[PDB]
Design a protein around this ligand. Structure first.
Ligand SMILES: *[C@@H]1O[C@H](CO)[C@@H](O[C@@H]2O[C@H](CO)[C@@H](O)[C@H](O)[C@H]2NC(C)=O)[C@H](O)[C@H]1NC(C)=O
Ligand SMILES: *[C@@H]1O[C@H](CO)[C@@H](O[C@@H]2O[C@H](CO)[C@@H](O)[C@H](O)[C@H]2NC(C)=O)[C@H](O)[C@H]1NC(C)=O
Ligand SMILES: C=CCn1c(=O)n([C@@H]2O[C@H](CO)[C@@H](O)[C@H]2O)c2nc(N)[nH]c(=O)c21
Ligand SMILES: C=CCn1c(=O)n([C@@H]2O[C@H](CO)[C@@H](O)[C@H]2O)c2nc(N)[nH]c(=O)c21
Ligand SMILES: *[C@@H]1O[C@H](CO)[C@@H](O)[C@H](O)[C@H]1NC(C)=O
Ligand SMILES: *[C@@H]1O[C@H](CO)[C@@H](O)[C@H](O)[C@H]1NC(C)=O
Ligand SMILES: *[C@@H]1O[C@H](CO)[C@@H](O)[C@H](O)[C@H]1NC(C)=O
Ligand SMILES: *[C@@H]1O[C@H](CO)[C@@H](O)[C@H](O)[C@H]1NC(C)=O
Ligand SMILES: *[C@@H]1O[C@H](CO)[C@@H](O)[C@H](O)[C@H]1NC(C)=O
Ligand SMILES: *[C@@H]1O[C@H](CO)[C@@H](O)[C@H](O)[C@H]1NC(C)=O
Lengths: 762, 762
RNA sequence: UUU
RNA sequence: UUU
């Protein structure tokens, strides 16, 4: 480079994007390009905005000035904002091309004035604005999107009811989206402009809908009235219900004007009845969320479903009656109306026994993909019943009591300041009480692609006779179980098995004297991936694992340290006969060193090797000559103190060397000499002081995709003159260059960034 | 003190004990007291011993010079010993009073010569000495104890058979203890001096005992011949069996001379028969270890037990037949002979069903205390059977398959280089497959004091009707289960319950929508201690826990960070009504801060409080005024950067302040002013540079039991003059004062210990 | 850093 | 650091 970075911001270029997110700034920086279209300054501590702020920046279409002063309870309690953001007059009115402005999370007291007529989007979430006046909104003639939420709630209280003048929004003739969520609003702020497409009014104090409230809103596609007269039972937040357990009162004709309506969410409204009359003039409804109400009875009746032939998703989760364990699930025949239904969820209805007939109302739903009966405390269920449901993508019985955060969020859509479904048909029996299994349990289920048994009781000496019906099965998640690997024939029946997870089945590996057989993988002739993480495996009766197919083995969280104890050669070839193995994760095996033999004993095609988080205190680098196809080596989070004298005499194939979080204090004189194949190198979080040219030749350095250097101990004396220069001028990506690549001394420069460092005197 | 305090060694004083264990020394230090009786230099890197080594140290009775050069595979692989310890002539022969010498782990090639005639004990374990000659042993006329083991085994191989000359030990007329374990010895080194009391010959290549091998050893109390013709099945180390699965051959009359013999260990000898004839002349046998042999059949017969009326412990663990799941436990009636038996262990016999009668041979054993049938894969057992065994201290069924390292060590006695039994009768059902429970399961067991159900399947909504027979129960370990705390009546039946462990029952706390009732503790009117660690508790339907009795609550590894989320007051009194609570562990709750109300909401008698390992980034010290009985505060492993301006305006009662492992860079000007009650203060592993007198006044400092200062960033300039002086002269214990309390600068003194620092120039 |  |  002719001139160094200097600017503390990622200047991408598409549109000219300047991104100064979380750069510990107290002023907008100098040097921002004149052609800047989008400028982001979110999470900084810039205490004011003036006409100087954006003076030259005439082509700005977007300003993201979020979270420079987030409200006290929302922010960090180490770094509390002492004084609200100040916005002086005239700061925005120069900006003719400005289309989006984001001033959320700045403790603003009022809608900021003097905004340009070009503005289409204004976002003021998480401020202290709880009174909307018509006069304050006339600057927004041309506004289309308006976020006003999260200014009066339990985490950012205003201590009063929210106030919106009569007809405040009406003369916003182009307004499409309006969000007043999380605000302590008491009524729908009539009259609303008919142009509205989305209206978010959830988590508020609206006790009633008047029948003229949505009179003119023909174009409305999304309505959310959730959390008004909330159902408070086991709320993980402060929850005040409406008096007498009352519901949100919605006149039978309240929706008659909403012809175009695609999404209606009535989550947590304490509803007991879903009067069919609501939906008379709503033909095209696609999505209905009725979760967290009191509709256990209404689900038996449910006449309203007769008016919903277009409905793709219906949510009836968490409608149980308190203190009531129903013996079964009374589903309405009405459900058969729901011709278009792709997704149905009925978690938290709370019943003991599921029988095949209770689901009969759904048998003809042609488009049905997802049936979710999770978290129902179901104790009894003949799983063969799902023979009818071969066409379903997912059948979720997760969290039950079978044995042969989302619904409880306050605001799941809240914005920040910053799987095996793809294998085919899936039956999720996770987190259930299944202690024993046998073939009959899976009879008529030969269609299943993924079976999830994670988090059951299964404490069984699997012999190959247990999943015998499941010959289409590609994925078995057997994690968080108590597999007893006595027989090498475990899992051999699953002849189509591509992926097996036996992670966190440590129980029986923790006790001495117990025969385990890790050689069970010869039998599984299509197995691509095996996960046996966190099993505490320190003993094995067989001494090799063999497979012709296995590409990936995750072996983290075991005791290879015991198996490879110095002077015990028995297990040095444990992975040798995994002949296709490209990827081996042996991180967290409390390996303080590697005996000779470990690398010779690796399989031939090893591409990607993780020894992360072991406590490695030493490492013979020369032994990487045995791993002739090695491309990524992960030695992160260890106690290594030195790099090889010559990486090119260790491994000519290595592209990615991860050394972050070690105890390296310098580099060897010719470290990277000749390592032309190297592309990525992470030396971050070490204790390096100096780096000379001999170690980091330009030949090799300038071909790196990335070089990570942050969190070291750089000495910024005139001995550092080459490195400081090189960093300052190189094209090579070096993340955190303007935040965490800093000098620690000498004196003057202590704390100073290497990129700002001007060492004239040399 | 008049003089620092410069020797790098704990000078205890009883006998004058000088201990320089692990002090990174390369020479014996100067200044060792002339009256030194015991000197320890184990784990250092002192490369030789000379007549200078001990010149002045004339009263020495013991030298522990262990592990200054441990063998390559036994030692650290970062810091491998480059060259064996050298012992020059005349180094020991000045020491007239020397009685013990420990030169283990120094890579010595030969028994060191020139030793004094006063010497009673010589230890040479973990060296490279594998040939014993008579000539080399004549210096030891007066030796009583001789450790020669661990010079030829898989971890420290000599590559040949061990050699002992005929009659090598015979002219050691005072020899009592001789250890040749772990040595590749092929025969008992005859003839042995009759004076031998203990003889350790385990883990060797001894295929046969000749009948003259122990002819003259009337005084022998302990014999160990274990691991000779080892049973190699699931050995966690390299194990070579005798050919044809042969046993260690022991002539029927081999023990006839051993009249005094108290302990006989025949562990891992591949024995099939225990011929009664062995024990004909051994009256007083107290301890017999027959574990890891092939005695499944012999246990049915077992005629030899008839000759063992004095036997206190019998071990028959791990004798199962490979590939054989016995339907029951064929115990001999012979067992009834064992009148004196206190402890019996029969782990790893491997059977399916235990019935009450199989134990009938033991019914009259009056002195029986411990019956251990662990690790037997027992699937069925009526636990009421133990009605007969009310007099037993412990009944261990740990590691089984019931549902209504030790035996596998190489050398368990190997030396290093450095519970609820007390409640009464105990039934350990740990690590079993018990999924459901009910009252009948515990019928006739009302005698039990401690029940251990740790590590079962138990996934049940305990209602108070499950342990109803157990009214003497003082201790329930319910850990590593799946408690479902739906009912507040859980555990109320156990009216004598002093201690309850529901730790690591996180399963059902990890899923949303599930009602949990932490208020179950009101009912339990004698409960002293409750452990509910590692439960992931982030949701609770009740908002208080009440108890009149509870002294200790361990709540580590939960989510108080969610329960006390800023702006949610509901849980701020969660512990208030634990009225007798003296001790609260709320470490590992990922608490980045504490909201106001947390300390006002603590119970009145809180004495010690742990907030360790939370990520605390700040802390209002002034709110410790609410904890008027606080005595220990543990804020270790957090991100705190400052201490209070005045600890005495925060808490006048605090005795023990633990601040280790934080980010403190300086102290407040008057930190400890007036804090006369303070006794312990740990400031170790921070980033402190200077400490002035104003912060650490003498009147407060000199009353400390302990002050921890290591692993800081001390700047050793003339500004440090008071602190360097104070550290140098004080009586107050400061651990690691000569190892990890060091200057980091300026220049000259970088790395130097504060205690050696001479500041004349200031 | 003899397990 | 809007969950
Ligand atoms: C939502 O508005 C209500 C009232 O309209 C606020 O509740 C009042 O709070 C003040 C100060 O705490 C009390 O003195 C009053 O008793 C309350 N009035 C009524 C009528 O209930 C509430 O604080 C607002 N919510 C938030 C989160 O700010
Ligand atoms: C124990 O002694 C045997 C000799 O009985 C040693 O085994 C020899 O090892 C060398 C390796 O260099 C072989 O070439 C010999 O042929 C082996 N001989 C036999 C008879 O097995 C053994 O190494 C010794 N054990 C240890 C642990 O040092
Ligand atoms: C087969 C049922 C009981 N069983 C058993 O006899 N054995 C035998 O126990 C011994 C140790 O595993 C061996 O003889 C082995 O074959 C067992 N080993 C394991 N791991 N699990 C069992 O359920 C079990
Ligand atoms: C009691 C039998 C089934 N059951 C139940 O009805 N409930 C009810 O389900 C709802 C959620 O826990 C509540 O109404 C609760 O009372 C349950 N809650 C838990 N935690 N565990 C059960 O086994 C269970
Ligand atoms: C830039 O701004 C426009 C309008 O605000 C927006 O639609 C676009 O996605 C923004 N692009 C980026 C990368 O921020
Ligand atoms: C199985 O269920 C658990 C939830 O209990 C989930 O974490 C996991 O991703 C699921 N497994 C797969 C393969 O989808
Ligand atoms: C697995 O291991 C043992 C040898 O330790 C052997 O008995 C068994 O037959 C092997 N089986 C397979 C399927 O590889
Ligand atoms: C000191 O040495 C004697 C004799 O060698 C020994 O018996 C004694 O226990 C040792 N004491 C201590 C405190 O190490
Ligand atoms: C219960 O059993 C486990 C062994 O599985 C043990 O760790 C624990 O200490 C035992 N509990 C008590 C209270 O002794
Ligand atoms: C608190 O009590 C004592 C200090 O008196 C200490 O031994 C104990 O381990 C401490 N534990 C916790 C959890 O605070």
């Amino acid at each position: 480079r002719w001139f160094p970075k200097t600017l503390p911001c990622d200047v991408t270029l598409d549109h000219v994007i300047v991104d100064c997110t979380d750069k510990h700034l107290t002023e907008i920086p100098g040097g921002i390009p004149t052609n800047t279209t989008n400028l982001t300054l979110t999470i900084n501590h810039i205490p004011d905005i003036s006409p100087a702020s954006f003076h030259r920046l005439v082509h700005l279409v977007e300003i993201d000035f979020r979270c420079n002063c987030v409200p006290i309870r929302l922010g960090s309690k180490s770094n509390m904002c002492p004084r609200r953001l100040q916005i002086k007059p005239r700061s925005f009115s120069g900006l003719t091309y400005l289309k989006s402005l984001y001033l959320d999370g700045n403790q603003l007291l009022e809608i900021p004035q003097g905004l340009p007529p070009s503005l289409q989007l204004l976002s003021l979430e998480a401020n202290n604005i709880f009174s909307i006046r018509k006069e304050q909104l006339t600057e927004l003639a041309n506004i289309e999107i308006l976020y006003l939420g999260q200014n009066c709630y339990y985490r950012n209280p205003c201590y009063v009811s929210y106030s919106i003048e009569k007809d405040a929004f009406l003369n916003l003739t182009k307004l499409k989206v309006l969000s007043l969520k999380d605000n302590n609003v008491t009524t729908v702020p009539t009259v609303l402009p008919s142009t509205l497409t989305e209206l978010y009014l959830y988590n508020n104090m609206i006790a009633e809908i008047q029948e003229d409230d949505f009179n003119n809103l023909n174009q409305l596609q999304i309505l959310d009235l959730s959390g008004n007269c909330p159902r408070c039972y086991n709320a993980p937040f402060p929850c005040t219900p409406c008096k007498n357990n009352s519901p949100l009162q919605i006149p039978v004709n309240a929706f008659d004007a909403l012809t175009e309506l695609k999404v209606l969410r009535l989550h947590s409204n304490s509803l007991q009845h879903v009067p069919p009359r609501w939906f008379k003039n709503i033909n095209n409804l696609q999505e209905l969320d009725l979760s967290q109400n009191f509709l256990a009875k209404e689900i038996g009746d449910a006449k309203f479903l007769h008016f919903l032939p277009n409905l793709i998703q219906l949510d009836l989760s968490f409608n149980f009656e308190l203190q009531v364990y129903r013996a079964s699930m009374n589903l309405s025949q009405a459900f058969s109306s729901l011709k278009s239904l792709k997704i149905l969820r009925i978690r938290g209805y709370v019943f003991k026994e599921l029988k095949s007939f209770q689901l009969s109302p759904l048998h003809n739903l042609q488009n049905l993909e997802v049936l979710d009966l999770g978290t129902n405390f179901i104790k009894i269920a003949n799983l063969s019943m799902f023979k009818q449901f071969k066409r379903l993508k997912v059948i979720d019985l997760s969290v039950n009591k079978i044995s042969p955060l989302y619904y409880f969020r306050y605001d799941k859509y809240a914005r920040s300041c910053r799987s095996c479904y793809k294998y085919g048909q899936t039956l999720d029996l996770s987190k259930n009480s299944i202690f024993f299994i046998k073939s009959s349990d899976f009879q008529h289920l030969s269609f299943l692609k993924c079976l999830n048994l994670s988090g059951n009781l299964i404490s069984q000496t699997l012999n190959g006779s247990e999943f015998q019906p499941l010959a289409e099965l590609r994925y078995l998640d057997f994690s968080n179980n108590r597999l007893d690997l006595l027989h090498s024939t475990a899992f051999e029946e699953l002849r189509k098995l591509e992926v097996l997870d036996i992670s966190s089945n440590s129980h029986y590996f923790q006790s001495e004297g117990i025969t385990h057989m890790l050689n069970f993988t010869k039998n599984l002739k299509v197995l691509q991936k095996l996960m046996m993480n966190d099993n505490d495996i320190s003993s094995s009766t067989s001494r090799t694992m063999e497979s012709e197919s296995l590409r990936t083995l995750e072996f983290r969280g075991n005791h290879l340290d015991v198996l490879w104890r110095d002077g015990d050669n028995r297990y040095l070839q444990l992975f040798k006969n995994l002949l296709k193995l490209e990827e081996l994760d042996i991180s967290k095996n409390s390996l303080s060193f590697l005996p000779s033999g470990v690398f010779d004993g690796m399989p031939p095609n090893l591409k990607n090797l993780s020894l992360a988080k072991n406590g490695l205190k030493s490492f013979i680098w020369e032994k990487l000559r045995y791993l002739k196809n090695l491309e990524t080596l992960d030695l992160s989070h260890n106690q290594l103190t030195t790099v090889p004298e010559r990486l090119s005499n260790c491994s000519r194939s290595l592209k990615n060397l991860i050394l972050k979080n070690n105890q390296i204090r310098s580099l060897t004189k010719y470290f990277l000499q000749d390592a032309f194949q190297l592309r990525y190198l992470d030396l971050s979080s070490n204790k390096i002081q100096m780096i000379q040219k001999t170690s980091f030749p330009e030949n090799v350095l300038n071909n790196l995709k990335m070089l990570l250097l942050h969190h070291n101990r750089f000495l910024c004396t005139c001995d550092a003159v080459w490195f400081v220069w090189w960093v300052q001028h190189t094209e090579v990506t070096i993340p955190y260059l303007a935040t965490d690549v800093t000098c620690v001394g000498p004196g003057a420069h202590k704390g100073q960034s290497v990129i700002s460092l001007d060492l004239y005197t040399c």
